[PDB]
């Protein structure tokens, strides 16, 4: 639905984030009854990408499939793919790491701690001695030790990988492997 629509919406997101299938299905049911399918779909895509994210990238991607199914079907049948994804999202590994990393990056810009794009990263089609831009694909492991962060932000670390699921365990390993390579 006595409750406001935004309180049901809030409890829906918090239930899925909180791994409670039954509560999330209860709040989905209330939303289905109220009938704003477009809002359910929007909120479901936010949840999968905010709270599940790198915990299960395939499942987060599958919410978009389910939403496209929902738009094509409409209620009552739309409720079926949404139920499927809600259960999947509730029980998958949770990660907000990428969401928080970008928000840390946005914080530095709004506070004016941003620098300029380093000259070797600028578009050469529009346009200092040295190697210029190094294309990683030419190198072993398709990686080159190169500065990409602006001079003012060379020490910035936004992304702290999590190990709640096997996908981000491996991404995190790669992240620290690169940090070892750079030293």
Chain residues 60-99 in contact with its own copies, contact rule CB under 8 A? 60-69, 72-73, 77, 79-88, 91-99
Cβ atoms of residues 115 and 151 within 8 Å: yes
| 40 lies in the binding site for its own copies (CB under 8 A) | no
Q: In the complex, what is the shortest distance from the CB of residue 36 to its own copies, in angstroms, rounded to a whole number?
A: 14
Contact of 85 with 63, CB cutoff 8 Å: yes
- 131/137 with CB nearer its own copies: 137
When asked if residue 35 is in the footprint of its own copies (CB under 8 A), the reply is no
DSSP string, 100-166: HHHHHHHHHHHTT---PPPGGGS-TTT---S-----GGGSGGG------S-GGGTT--------SSH
Site for its own copies in 139-168 (CB under 8 A): 141-144, 146, 148-150, 153, 156-159, 162, 164
> According to CB under 8 A, which one of 111, 126, 180, 183 is a site residue for its own copies?
126
């Amino acid at each position: 639905d006595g409750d406001a629509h935004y309180d049901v919406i809030s409890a829906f997101q918090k239930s899925i984030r909180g791994s409670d299938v039954d509560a999330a299905l209860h709040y989905l049911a209330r939303l289905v009854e109220a009938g704003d399918l477009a809002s359910i779909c929007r909120r479901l895509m936010v949840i999968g990408y905010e709270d599940i994210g790198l915990g299960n990238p395939a499942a987060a991607a599958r919410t978009v499939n389910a939403v496209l199914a929902a738009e094509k079907l409409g209620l009552p049948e739309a409720r079926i793919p949404l139920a499927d994804v809600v259960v999947d999202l509730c029980l998958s590994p949770k990660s907000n790491s990428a969401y928080m990393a970008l928000d840390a990056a946005l914080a530095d810009i709004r506070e004016g701690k941003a620098g300029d794009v380093p000259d070797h990263l600028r578009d050469s089609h529009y346009k200092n001695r040295g190697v210029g831009y190094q294309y990683p694909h030419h190198f072993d492991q398709a990686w080159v030790n190169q500065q990409y962060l602006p001079d003012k932000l060379k020490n910035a670390q936004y992304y702290q990988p999590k190990d709640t699921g096997k996908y981000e365990q491996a991404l995190g390993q790669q992240y620290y492997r690169i940090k070892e390579w750079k030293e």
